[PDB]
């Protein structure tokens, strides 16, 4: 086997962590660098390949893509790390007062017995014009090279019963640290959209903990360069409808995904297969650099999204496709 993947041992968490972060462009205004979500099955996809110089130029091409449930995500804190001779050293993190039940729940292993007294005497540290709070912001604003944001999943929106929000650090590649903080100041408690991190037709890498078996498996793996096909939004009906097909249907197959629910909010559709399995948390980073290849230049024209039920077999797409073929039966009339 491969030597570099040693020790082949258990990951620390269900949530694998972003080892690297994208560099910096100081000319840009402030931008997030990554985003989190949950793996949700595999779907078949067809489109015409507008790749020049190709043996499959302009022809129809069929490929399996994974959909990842990515809800809008909420800031609860900002962090400042100083550069040291010894690397990096978070000198201060600072939070946002109005924390949700989901975030607080991350601070208790036993939520039921608890007196739920968590960010409380810290919330009374907030209760004034600022003073102590605005001090610790100025602390960061003075020193510290990289400014990272504390955020958590909106898991109540999720069709998962795990109920306990995941915390993940995501840094900021917007230039000047004065801007960095004065972007995190305004964006405390505010929910952050998925389409405001990634567009369609983009290369991204993904992180996830791998499908455990019986030691074998259950390692953190990062795959690199994967094209986002579709960014959909939960408020817009007909996600399955392309510019071609245009029949009103959701990307969710008839009766939800395999061991995963209805997709009642925003999602990402990524080329090929993300590591791990459905339910697992994945964090998507924006590829560290600019990989200008014709593999990355092409803007895709999706044709049709296979929304057949993968549980068992799928001969049809919508419930409207069952009774147009069957007609009408016993229990109906």
């Amino acid at each position: 086997g491969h030597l570099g993947f040693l020790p082949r041992k258990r990951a620390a968490s269900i949530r694998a962590r972003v080892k690297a972060f994208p560099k910096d462009d100081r000319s840009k205004p402030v931008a997030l660098t990554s985003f989190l979500g949950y793996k949700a099955g595999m779907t078949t996809i067809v489109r015409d390949l507008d790749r020049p110089g190709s043996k499959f130029h302009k022809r129809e091409v069929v490929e399996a893509v994974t959909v990842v449930d990515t809800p809008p995500v909420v800031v609860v804190g900002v962090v400042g790390y100083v550069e040291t001779p010894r690397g990096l050293r978070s000198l201060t993190t600072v939070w946002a007062e109005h924390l949700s039940d989901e975030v607080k729940r991350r601070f208790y292993k036993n939520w039921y017995k608890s007196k739920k007294k968590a960010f409380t005497k810290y919330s009374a540290k907030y209760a004034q014009d600022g003073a102590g709070i605005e001090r610790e912001l100025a602390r960061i604003k003075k020193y510290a090279s990289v400014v990272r944001v504390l955020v958590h999943t909106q898991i109540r929106k999720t069709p998962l019963a795990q109920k306990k929000a995941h915390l993940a650090e995501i840094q900021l590649n917007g230039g000047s640290i004065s801007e960095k903080v004065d972007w995190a100041r305004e964006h405390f408690e505010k929910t952050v959209a998925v389409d405001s991190v990634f567009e369609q037709n983009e290369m991204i890498d993904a992180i996830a903990v791998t499908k455990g078996h019986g030691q074998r498996g259950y390692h953190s793996r990062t795959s690199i360069n994967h094209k986002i096909y579709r960014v959909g939004k939960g408020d817009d009906e007909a996600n399955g409808a392309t510019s071609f097909d245009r029949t009103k249907k959701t990307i969710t197959p008839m009766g939800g995904f395999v061991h995963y629910g209805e997709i009642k909010n925003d999602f990402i559709m990524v080329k090929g297969c993300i590591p791990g399995n459905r339910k697992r948390i994945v964090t998507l980073r924006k590829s560290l650099y600019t990989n200008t290849s014709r593999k990355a230049l092409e803007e895709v024209s999706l044709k049709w999204i296979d929304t057949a039920s993968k549980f068992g077999k799928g001969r049809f797409q919508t419930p409207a496709e069952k009774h147009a073929f069957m007609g009408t039966l016993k229990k109906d009339l």
Partner: protein, 52 residues
């Protein structure tokens, strides 16, 4: 044959860097400054539903 760490593909994928996919990020960067900043304005509407 050339490696990934060879001098050929390093020079080739250095010239093309300043293409469209530095500006497509900037075109999306405004949507971060638009709808996410509209989330600041939408919650300011509900705060004016509470201040009334």
């Amino acid at each position: 044959a050339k490696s990934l760490r060879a001098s050929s593909h390093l020079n080739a994928k250095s010239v093309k860097r300043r293409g469209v996919f530095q500006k497509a990020v900037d075109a999306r960067e405004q949507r971060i400054s638009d709808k996410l900043k509209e989330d600041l304005l939408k919650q300011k509407l509900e705060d004016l539903k509470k201040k009334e």
